[PDB]
Amino acid sequence: PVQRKLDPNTPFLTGMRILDVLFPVAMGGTAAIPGPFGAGKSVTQQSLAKWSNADVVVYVGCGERGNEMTDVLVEFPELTDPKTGGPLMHRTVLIANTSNMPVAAREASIYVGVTIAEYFRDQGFSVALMADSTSRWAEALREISSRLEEMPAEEGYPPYLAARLAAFYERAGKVITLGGEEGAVTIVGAVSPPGGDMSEPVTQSTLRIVGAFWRLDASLAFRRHFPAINWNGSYSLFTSALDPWYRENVAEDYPELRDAISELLQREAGLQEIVQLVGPDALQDAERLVIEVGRIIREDFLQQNAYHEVDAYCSMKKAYGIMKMILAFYKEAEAAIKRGVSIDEILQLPVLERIGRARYVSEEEFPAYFEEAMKEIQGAFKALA
Amino acid sequence: MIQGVIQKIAGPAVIAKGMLGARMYDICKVGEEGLVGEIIRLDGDTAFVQVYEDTSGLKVGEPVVSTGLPLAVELGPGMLNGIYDGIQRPLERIREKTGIYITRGVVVHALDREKKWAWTPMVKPGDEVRGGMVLGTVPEFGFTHKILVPPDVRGRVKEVKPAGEYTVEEPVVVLEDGTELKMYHTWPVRRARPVQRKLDPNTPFLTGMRILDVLFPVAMGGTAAIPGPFGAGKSVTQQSLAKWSNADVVVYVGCGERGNEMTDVLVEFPELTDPKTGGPLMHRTVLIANTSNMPVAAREASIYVGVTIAEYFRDQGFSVALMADSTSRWAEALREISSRLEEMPAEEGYPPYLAARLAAFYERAGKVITLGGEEGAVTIVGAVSPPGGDMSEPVTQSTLRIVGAFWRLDASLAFRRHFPAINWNGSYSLFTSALDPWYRENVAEDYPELRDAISELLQREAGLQEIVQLVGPDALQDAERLVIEVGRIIREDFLQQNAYHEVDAYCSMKKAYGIMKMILAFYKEAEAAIKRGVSIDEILQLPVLERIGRARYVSEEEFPAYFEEAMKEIQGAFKALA
Amino acid sequence: DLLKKEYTGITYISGPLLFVENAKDLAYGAIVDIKDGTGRVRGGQVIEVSEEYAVIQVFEETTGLDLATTSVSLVEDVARLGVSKEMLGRRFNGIGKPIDGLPPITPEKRLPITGLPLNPVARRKPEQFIQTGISTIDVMNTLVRGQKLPIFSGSGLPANEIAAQIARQATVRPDLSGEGEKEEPFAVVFAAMGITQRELSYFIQEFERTGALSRSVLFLNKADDPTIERILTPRMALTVAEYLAFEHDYHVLVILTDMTNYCEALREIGAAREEIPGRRGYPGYMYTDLATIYERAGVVEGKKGSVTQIPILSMPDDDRTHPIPDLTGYITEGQIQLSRELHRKGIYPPIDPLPSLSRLMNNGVGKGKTREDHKQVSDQLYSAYANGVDIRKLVAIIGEDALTENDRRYLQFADAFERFFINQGQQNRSIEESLQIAWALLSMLPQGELKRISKDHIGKYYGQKLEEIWG
Amino acid sequence: NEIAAQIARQATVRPDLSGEGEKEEPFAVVFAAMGITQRELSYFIQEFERTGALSRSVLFLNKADDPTIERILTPRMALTVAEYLAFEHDYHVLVILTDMTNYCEALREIGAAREEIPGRRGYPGYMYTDLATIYERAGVVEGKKGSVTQIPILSMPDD
Amino acid sequence: TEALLARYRERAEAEAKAVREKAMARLDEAVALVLKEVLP
Amino acid sequence: ESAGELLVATARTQARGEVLEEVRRRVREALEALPQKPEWPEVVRKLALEALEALPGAKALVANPEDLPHLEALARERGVELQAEPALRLGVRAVGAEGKTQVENSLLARLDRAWDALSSKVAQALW
Amino acid sequence: IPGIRAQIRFIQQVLEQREREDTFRLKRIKGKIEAREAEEE
Numbered sequence A: 001p002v003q004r005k006l007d008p009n010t011p012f013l014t015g016m017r018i019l020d021v022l023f024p025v026a027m028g029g030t031a032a033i034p035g036p037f038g039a040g041k042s043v044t045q046q047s048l049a050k051w052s053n054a055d056v057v058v059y060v061g062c063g064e065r066g067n068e069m070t071d072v073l074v075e076f077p078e079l080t081d082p083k084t085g086g087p088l089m090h091r092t093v094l095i096a097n098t099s100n101m102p103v104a105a106r107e108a109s110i111y112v113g114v115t116i117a118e119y120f121r122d123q124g125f126s127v128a129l130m131a132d133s134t135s136r137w138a139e140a141l142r143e144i145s146s147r148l149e150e151m152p153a154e155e156g157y158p159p160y161l162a163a164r165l166a167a168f169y170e171r172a173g174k175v176i177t178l179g180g181e182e183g184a185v186t187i188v189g190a191v192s193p194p195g196g197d198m199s200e201p202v203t204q205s206t207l208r209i210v211g212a213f214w215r216l217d218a219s220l221a222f223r224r225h226f227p228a229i230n231w232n233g234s235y236s237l238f239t240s241a242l243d244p245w246y247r248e249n250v251a252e253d254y255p256e257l258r259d260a261i262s263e264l265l266q267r268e269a270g271l272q273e274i275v276q277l278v279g280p281d282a283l284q285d286a287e288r289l290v291i292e293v294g295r296i297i298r299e300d301f302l303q304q305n306a307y308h309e310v311d312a313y314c315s316m317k318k319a320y321g322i323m324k325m326i327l328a329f330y331k332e333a334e335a336a337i338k339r340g341v342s343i344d345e346i347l348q349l350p351v352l353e354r355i356g357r358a359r360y361v362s363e364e365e366f367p368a369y370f371e372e373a374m375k376e377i378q379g380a381f382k383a384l385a
Numbered sequence B: 001m002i003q004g005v006i007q008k009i010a011g012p013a014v015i016a017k018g019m020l021g022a023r024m025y026d027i028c029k030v031g032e033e034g035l036v037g038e039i040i041r042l043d044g045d046t047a048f049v050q051v052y053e054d055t056s057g058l059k060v061g062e063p064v065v066s067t068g069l070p071l072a073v074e075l076g077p078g079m080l081n082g083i084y085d086g087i088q089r090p091l092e093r094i095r096e097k098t099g100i101y102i103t104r105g106v107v108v109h110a111l112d113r114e115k116k117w118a119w120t121p122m123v124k125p126g127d128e129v130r131g132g133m134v135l136g137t138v139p140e141f142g143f144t145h146k147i148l149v150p151p152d153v154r155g156r157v158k159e160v161k162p163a164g165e166y167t168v169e170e171p172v173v174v175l176e177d178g179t180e181l182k183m184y185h186t187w188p189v190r191r192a193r194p195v196q197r198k199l200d201p202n203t204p205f206l207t208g209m210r211i212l213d214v215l216f217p218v219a220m221g222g223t224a225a226i227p228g229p230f231g232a233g234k235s236v237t238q239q240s241l242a243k244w245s246n247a248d249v250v251v252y253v254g255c256g257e258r259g260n261e262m263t264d265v266l267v268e269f270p271e272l273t274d275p276k277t278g279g280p281l282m283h284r285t286v287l288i289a290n291t292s293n294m295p296v297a298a299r300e301a302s303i304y305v306g307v308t309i310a311e312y313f314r315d316q317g318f319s320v321a322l323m324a325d326s327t328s329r330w331a332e333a334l335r336e337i338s339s340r341l342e343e344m345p346a347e348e349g350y351p352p353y354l355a356a357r358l359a360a361f362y363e364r365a366g367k368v369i370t371l372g373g374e375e376g377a378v379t380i381v382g383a384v385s386p387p388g389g390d391m392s393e394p395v396t397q398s399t400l401r402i403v404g405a406f407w408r409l410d411a412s413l414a415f416r417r418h419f420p421a422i423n424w425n426g427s428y429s430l431f432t433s434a435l436d437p438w439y440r441e442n443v444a445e446d447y448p449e450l451r452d453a454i455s456e457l458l459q460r461e462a463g464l465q466e467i468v469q470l471v472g473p474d475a476l477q478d479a480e481r482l483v484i485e486v487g488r489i490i491r492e493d494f495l496q497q498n499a500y501h502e503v504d505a506y507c508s509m510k511k512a513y514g515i516m517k518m519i520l521a522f523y524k525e526a527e528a529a530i531k532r533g534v535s536i537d538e539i540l541q542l543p544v545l546e547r548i549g550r551a552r553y554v555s556e557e558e559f560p561a562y563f564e565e566a567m568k569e570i571q572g573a574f575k576a577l578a
Numbered sequence C: 001d002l003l004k005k006e007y008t009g010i011t012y013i014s015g016p017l018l019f020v021e022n023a024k025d026l027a028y029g030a031i032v033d034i035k036d037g038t039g040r041v042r043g044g045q046v047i048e049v050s051e052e053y054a055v056i057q058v059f060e061e062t063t064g065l066d067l068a069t070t071s072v073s074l075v076e077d078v079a080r081l082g083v084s085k086e087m088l089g090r091r092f093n094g095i096g097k098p099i100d101g102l103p104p105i106t107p108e109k110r111l112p113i114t115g116l117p118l119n120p121v122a123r124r125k126p127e128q129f130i131q132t133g134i135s136t137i138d139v140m141n142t143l144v145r146g147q148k149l150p151i152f153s154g155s156g157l158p159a160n161e162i163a164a165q166i167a168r169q170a171t172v173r174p175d176l177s178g179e180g181e182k183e184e185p186f187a188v189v190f191a192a193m194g195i196t197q198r199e200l201s202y203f204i205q206e207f208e209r210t211g212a213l214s215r216s217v218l219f220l221n222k223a224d225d226p227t228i229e230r231i232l233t234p235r236m237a238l239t240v241a242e243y244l245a246f247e248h249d250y251h252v253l254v255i256l257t258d259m260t261n262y263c264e265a266l267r268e269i270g271a272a273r274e275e276i277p278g279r280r281g282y283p284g285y286m287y288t289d290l291a292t293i294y295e296r297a298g299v300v301e302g303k304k305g306s307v308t309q310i311p312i313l314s315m316p317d318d319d320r321t322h323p324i325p326d327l328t329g330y331i332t333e334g335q336i337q338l339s340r341e342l343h344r345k346g347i348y349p350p351i352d353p354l355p356s357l358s359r360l361m362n363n364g365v366g367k368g369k370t371r372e373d374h375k376q377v378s379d380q381l382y383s384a385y386a387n388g389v390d391i392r393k394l395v396a397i398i399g400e401d402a403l404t405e406n407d408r409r410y411l412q413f414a415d416a417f418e419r420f421f422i423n424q425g426q427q428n429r430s431i432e433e434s435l436q437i438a439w440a441l442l443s444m445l446p447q448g449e450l451k452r453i454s455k456d457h458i459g460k461y462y463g464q465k466l467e468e469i470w471g
Numbered sequence D: 001n002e003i004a005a006q007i008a009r010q011a012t013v014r015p016d017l018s019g020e021g022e023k024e025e026p027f028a029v030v031f032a033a034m035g036i037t038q039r040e041l042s043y044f045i046q047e048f049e050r051t052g053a054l055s056r057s058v059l060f061l062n063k064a065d066d067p068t069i070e071r072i073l074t075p076r077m078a079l080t081v082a083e084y085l086a087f088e089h090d091y092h093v094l095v096i097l098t099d100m101t102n103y104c105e106a107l108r109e110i111g112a113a114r115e116e117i118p119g120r121r122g123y124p125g126y127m128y129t130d131l132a133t134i135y136e137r138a139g140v141v142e143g144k145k146g147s148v149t150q151i152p153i154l155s156m157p158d159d
Numbered sequence E: 001t002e003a004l005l006a007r008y009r010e011r012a013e014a015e016a017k018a019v020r021e022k023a024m025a026r027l028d029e030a031v032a033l034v035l036k037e038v039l040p
Numbered sequence F: 001e002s003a004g005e006l007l008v009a010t011a012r013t014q015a016r017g018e019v020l021e022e023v024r025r026r027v028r029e030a031l032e033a034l035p036q037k038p039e040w041p042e043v044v045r046k047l048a049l050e051a052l053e054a055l056p057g058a059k060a061l062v063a064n065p066e067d068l069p070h071l072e073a074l075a076r077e078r079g080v081e082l083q084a085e086p087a088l089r090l091g092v093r094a095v096g097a098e099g100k101t102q103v104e105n106s107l108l109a110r111l112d113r114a115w116d117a118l119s120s121k122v123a124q125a126l127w
Numbered sequence G: 001i002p003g004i005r006a007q008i009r010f011i012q013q014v015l016e017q018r019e020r021e022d023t024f025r026l027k028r029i030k031g032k033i034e035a036r037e038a039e040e041e
């Protein structure tokens, strides 16, 4: 029990550019991240477990591999917690029920994890809870229902699956605890749809209660594009309520900058169908420019390397800097083409090299790099006249 | 009678024990309130009863009694201009007794027992009467309700009442055996009323809609179906067909449909006029109502009551039109009952005998020589409501093999708000050939040739639409473009009709013939002109096109002159131009 | 009456069901209460009685019950709710208990929650126009008083915002119809089934901001509450609405949060009982059960009250061939279908005009009820938008450099329609402004195109410029 | 089969790059067959004989004429032997399983006999757990030198 | 707007006290009626 | 400005509820003053007769821990009369049917069952 | 053409799966009713 439920108004920063910028999730909100095998669910969840700003992280390994649990236990003790600076393992609680361990214990794992997270919330912290896969939980429910001889609903799942999922996801939110202080719980539950089909009963039942939907795509993963988040099929319902915080903490004009980036991405997504049947040359200069800036955005902003020493983590100011660089380059490019400059000459400009490596520059060195790159961009076209 | 006690209650289904000797499909009274039920399964010493009303509040041990008869109706004077429930209980009387709500356990008499009727005999003592012979006639709203001998009755007349004022319950004829004939009798709804002989379709059933009357006509005594997804426009079409048809008596059956539609019919009809004679429209209608929330077991009874009343009025010698608002609800009711019975489903949950029931219902239609030697007919138009609009669905498939006409409704045209919105490719009619001599005698001597040409044009247009989709309208030659434009003109100016318009709502046959003639003449002229080299664009700009487009809005008494003017204008437009 | 009869002899507890033996004096559909060994008392309803035993569905969860110490006692033979005029401004849970901290209500009368069907002879034809302030509804899918008009929604689409805005802006226009400006606000009855805390917070703060809580009755069943209570909540809400409307001549607007959760609960009960499923697991009587809910709205001859019903449901995977939206389409008088493709483009409210429909539209539009050219303008707009979409597909197939000027005009018309007639962020438009915008949009095409509008109206209205609408 | 045989023949650990300097003791091989034909089996046998590896291998063969229900047990025995060798005699075991399609088919047949609740194409709903109990027996353990490596080969129906 | 709350608070207290003093008068008749109804 | 009207409505509701609760407390005291009344040996018999007529074929009766002789005087009607010390609430505390399954309760604290329906009547009586 | 082929095979798979689920539920119900009858003798 608690005293009261509150409205989320602060962000839960994950350290990943696309998730933190395009599809934010607030403290006390819930997110779901479906995806076919190999798309990058586990790496994304572990990255959240390593770079999040939550005080305590509870990682629930419900019915997955054991090498992942060994990886956590071997690496986390060496890494450092961002907040206190101590070892990372001093922050995390692991609930491990691997695949070959008894099937009926997965539901127990889920409930144990959520209860411990609620306890730590009662202490006044803000807790991040990561469910490795709820599909395994639903599989255990289906098996037990089979032993009971009940009538299935769809694909063998019992008809009460949606109610159980709702009960699990509802225990999140920012609260005023019985002690009168403030705390919150954030739940990020991964779904493993069969064959990458989003019409599975588990996915449809999960999408009715979560506030954010991070759709992983296999085709982006084949190309070694990561995190491989489909930005056309994803959404977020906390984007409007977090605007005052963004204006206070990141910059005053951040929402407009992000909207501009999103609109550019929509336009190049719209033109993709036309261009893939006729070729980039058969299009006017504006569309070639917008396609190239879309390629820049999706290779130098959205992409992120979790195994790099620097690219693994990204603050909001760094993302803001990268977005400003891209939009300055784009506006100058429209102006230059309107003056009559060729697209290929623009493409072979050297400042694009500064843009492309911007995400590999560390946090300390970033502001000066950003300032020099902005001066370089504004001077590049002026010389090009 | 049989008296047993309730052994188990579960929803609308009641198991009664101690019912040895009960007969299948008999009417029972359930509980102390005397709710009406029907025995559908006998097992050992028990019976399975489905209740026609709500069962909440019953208890184990309450009595169950058996009336000993199957479901029946009272056929006689007093049915016209009345509205009934699924088992023929007047709703106005229920409203007077109860209030704005319908309470269970209410019993009323289908025919009024106090009204006085003007009786004039037509037989004399000593005469021999058989089932269906006419005994005497009474006036009913300008009709002539004929009193009939019940179909299983024969004998000799002892006494007959003199002309005067009588009630329905006064027996006017007494036979030698002592059997007494009243002004009414009863008939079980599940037994078809017998006839002398079945005739062939001969004459058209004029629906008042150009597309149905012209491309896919339906003959008197025929059957048709109108399947389609929700929003396509079945209800408007059926209401219009009830309002504008040439049938003598209209029987509308509301099988489990929106109540507001029944209210709209009830409110609007008393303010419209019968086209045939000029009296109010409602004095020719029997309106059976059964809204969605009304008891589930009563929908089947509603269908059967409607068709039985239709058969009775056919026996009187009239020509009866019958509309079933939605037969998919009837199938759903059957499915619910079979689900209660724990019977094996056949396909998509429907009971095995769905097709048999549908065929038995739809075969009651036809033109017959009545048992009294008079002529009559029943025309059945059932509306089909497939779940997703999927036409592979078992109800649509089953009804597809029994009807003589099919009127498939297009969802795409309904989205475009282009009505009547009938999918021309998927529609057909088998009554086309048998009606040709009537068309020659009553419409025009070359009407079949014009409709054949129109159908050929439509077939060519649909055939070319594939190329239009492949390469676009700009790549076709001039002749193909002209065919496309002619198809569009036909669709926009002939096949389209506005139900709520004052003029466009009803279109006689001659008007449709004239419109088709005008369009065909324009097509001839345009073809001749393009063969002369005139560019297609100017052909699409001629002033006669607006006249063709506007021809449908012309009132009936002005059309004869406007047609000649338009024909002369079409001839002159291409005569002068080249 | 005041005697308390208890039944032990429970033999079977599994999921939501509970079998009690003997107990031949439990009426079908009766309401009971289950008391366990610790003294906590739950609730339940009888759904089938027999000589051997009776079947009871347990409203709460069944944790801690046992066959040795539990007992079941009868409460009433027919389920009922206590109504009064003084529940306006109160909050209850799904079962009807207050949750606002205030003392329990005192009923003026007790009404059965299953309701009774309105006699069709008694009903009345709905005429009065309702102006919701949304152009894509008022002009093209008019809503009349006494109609039920569900909103077909999706996974992430904002149906709650649309419903809240409708309730905030809904008003009749007696000045246009000349009936005297009685100026009576809508009373709002809100029923929620498995609604999450986020959406509930939004609705509560919205009603609070508008101040409509003073004339609102709320029945809330949150997503963490027992799932079997959802069977009763719509019936509680509609009984309250019908009492208010037809006993005190109120005008009530009913909003049902998620009929999808209602169908979830319905099939869970159906599957617990081992009955033949109709489709995808849903019971075969779902049509009848939903019709018992939707059809309790309308207008009654001789009474001033009215019940207007706005269900909200989410189509799974945006498939309107799913059983729930399909059956609801067969029951209601129309639908307002939202479109994700408009939502992704940033258009609010993302109402797709083509699949949307209002069956009672032309009972309430025309000469003496609104402006005269309403119907023909709506038809012309539908035709032109369909032409625009078709040309969009044509350009998808072949290059646009082959387009005629006519196709270009239609394509630009579709774009302008989507960006001006549909898009309005939280903006209230009187019917006059919406019709003016519609004529301004139509003025992008020649008078030769506008086939469905009569010439007189063209003469009076054609020719407005879109850039003159706003300064 | 060609790729599997080539990998079995050419497998080395390259210790010099890792700086361990430990001598490369040759891989022990366990080859478990589930419903393979005679031509494939003969091919494997001549390959193993030619490369000289048949003295380091344990062969668990289930020919296509063998009973289907037996195919449930073969991978379990093969991995039991592999685990025994690796974790109690310091071997580096390389395990290849011939066609998990046959194993899944045997599982489906016995499940359809048992009237279990199906999954996505008639396969039992517990097939994930059944496959996991087999696959998860591979890996390395701290404090020991042995290891178990798996390359099961399966043919995707319809590609 | 502060004056509105200042007035309405004491207004509510006064009206509640008025209703309580009204109800205190006919209390014993009420308990007598309840006792009459309950007893067989 | 809806805050003031909200407060007025809440205060009025609170006053009405508090008064009705006091009515209930007084009724509880008055019912609890039954046992020494001369009508009590009559009301116990009426409770027992109602309980027995409601449940045909009863097996047993329970009574006060006093083993009330007034209820014992009906020994010539049914089989067994047992004592129920824990069952304090005045009246007939249980009626064990012939099967051990079903019991009946005709006893004070039926006020709980009656108050829900007479609350409106006493509320209109007060105001 | 490949896109249409992929959509066709997807739809066929979905419809097949729905049919199989219906059949399994029918078998389960029929067997359970028979078993209750057998216990009832």
Ligand SMILES: Nc1ncnc2c1ncn2[C@@H]1O[C@H](COP(=O)(O)OP(=O)(O)OP(=O)(O)O)[C@@H](O)[C@H]1O
Pocket: A035, A036, A037, A038, A039, A040, A041, A042, A043, A044, A226, A227, A304, A305, A306, A307
């Ligand atoms: N941000 C990233 N940077 C680099 N590689 C990545 C990233 N995200 C995913 N990957 C790659 O994706 C692979 C598989 O990802 P992951 O294990 O998270 O997927 P999954 O969907 O959780 O898989 P599983 O089926 O085991 O549940 C990783 O081994 C890694 O190589």
Ligand SMILES: Nc1ncnc2c1ncn2[C@@H]1O[C@H](COP(=O)(O)OP(=O)(O)O)[C@@H](O)[C@H]1O
Pocket: B229, B230, B231, B232, B233, B234, B235, B236, B237, B419, B420, B497, B498, B499, B500, C358, C359, C360, C362
């Ligand atoms: N022939 C028609 N003429 C004009 N409008 C029509 C016509 N047919 C249908 N409509 C319109 O389409 C709507 C479809 O409603 P309705 O016919 O009741 O639906 P259904 O498809 O369920 O029968 C009607 O409300 C009306 O506005």
Ligand SMILES: [Mg+2]
Pocket: A041, A042, A064
């Ligand atoms: Mg994973």
Ligand SMILES: [Mg+2]
Pocket: B234, B235, B236
């Ligand atoms: Mg209709």
